[PDB]
Design a protein around this ligand. Sequence first.
Ligand code: NA
Lengths: 409, 204
Amino acid sequence: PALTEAKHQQQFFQFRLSGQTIEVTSEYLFRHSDNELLHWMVALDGKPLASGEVPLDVAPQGKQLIELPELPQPESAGQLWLTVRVVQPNATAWSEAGHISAWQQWRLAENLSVTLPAASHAIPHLTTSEMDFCIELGNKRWQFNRQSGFLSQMWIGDKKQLLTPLRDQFTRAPLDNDIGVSEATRIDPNAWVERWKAAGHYQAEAALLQCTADTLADAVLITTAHAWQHQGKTLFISRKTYRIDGSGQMAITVDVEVASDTPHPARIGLNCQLAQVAERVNWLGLGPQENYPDRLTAACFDRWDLPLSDMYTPYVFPSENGLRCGTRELNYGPHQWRGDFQFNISRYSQQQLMETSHRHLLHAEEGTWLNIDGFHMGIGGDDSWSPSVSAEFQLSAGRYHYQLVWCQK
Amino acid sequence: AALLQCTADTLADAVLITTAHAWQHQGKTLFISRKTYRIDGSGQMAITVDVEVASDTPHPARIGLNCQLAQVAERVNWLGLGPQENYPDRLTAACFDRWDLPLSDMYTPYVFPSENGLRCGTRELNYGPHQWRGDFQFNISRYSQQQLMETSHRHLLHAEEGTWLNIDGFHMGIGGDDSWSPSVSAEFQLSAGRYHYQLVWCQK
Ligand code: NA
């Protein structure tokens, strides 16, 4: 995946936008742009609106100005994105026709959605057992374990949807950059994986603080709190609210506290193993390739649709992989998640990736592991023998907030 | 402000008010604010605020609440950065501790009146019978942001009835590399798009 990031940063055409005018700059020192068009696409949350191509005639170290036509200006809700591609129409000795050599993206206009959703014809019903809070609406059932405090299972008809409960996750299968030169024999305490392991991040057990059900006029409200401890020290606290409304939508609100003096965690999100194994993964966000907070400049905001196999990156030493960032919608089988999040999705658990030394020893697990993070630590890589993740990409904030909506389709 | 949603619910141990406003100007929606007020058996009001800011409007000066209190107390007591005025890009000299000052010292008499007297990184603020807890920046004065904005000299300011309280989840840097061009650096601009902050309002 890193190659695209190299391609994007090393590109020979740099862009600036002012109003509807694009300043293209040439960083070539000897040749004109004698084999280059600029293609441009304007899109509203992935749906294309306007297109077009304009010839490029930039002297070496020169500038060309390009005025766009009066773009489409819809009242419909969403963010408008401009994307430009530089395309070589002709083959070279090193490339074939239609090769893309450079690109750049901008947000244009956003119109926030102000409409209230239409009132539902139905109210979701709460069923209280000693062991469970269960919620029914139509063909759909939700079950919350009152001993654990997690969503244990969801139903569409007789069909169960989960193999593992939906739980918080503050750890990732360590990257080569998290490990450095640390070895089982000779530990390096300065490596991120060792700081994490020493602090109990990987061995932290969840302790239920609160687990409460309430009925509202139009919804059921499940409210929970867990503390993750290691040998007496409280590392993380997660407070959630699950709000299931008449439309079959489950709004999850997460509010996490991280102890100031524990090593900054690798991620703040949820994960679960779903029962479904679908062939395609469709998301609105940065893509199409794998991208991380400190490696997402080559990625672009659009609708992407790839096979599940392409959402796993076969690094020979298995680690956390296949994350996409800045995602507003994710689709997998009947499931849809909405919000503002990072995700990865594969047949391989963070547990299996962490414990397996070679990609050829991995086995597909029963279902599909889904990690949804509100926040993810940078990957670093200025070197691979000392901590390389810059301060801006470490999760030091202390308090974190993220919101998901889980619904069916 | 245009009211979108205003609902009440009764829970086992508390009452929950949920609201949603849109701030508009000539057809353009600039901000949306979704809140939950949760008043529980202990007389404590827990307010959750979730704001959207349009990506193409200028990054706003602050994101918080404000009210005029009836109370005028003689002292202000807070746990956070102080004792002096401090802003996000000017708080290195400030130190985290419990600060107790006269309300006079919570206002900075700049000759040209502006926003002033903010303290940042505060977990607890105490004024008269009121306590607010959370993670916020505040200023507290007898002078509304409106009076300060409309007044050109400090000697023409008049104490209004009661006490104006600004509690911000987030507050833009003050800049100052020069004062004839924008000088607040990107990291101190409110460009995130979605913001969240949480207060609890208390009696003592
Ligand atoms: Na491994």
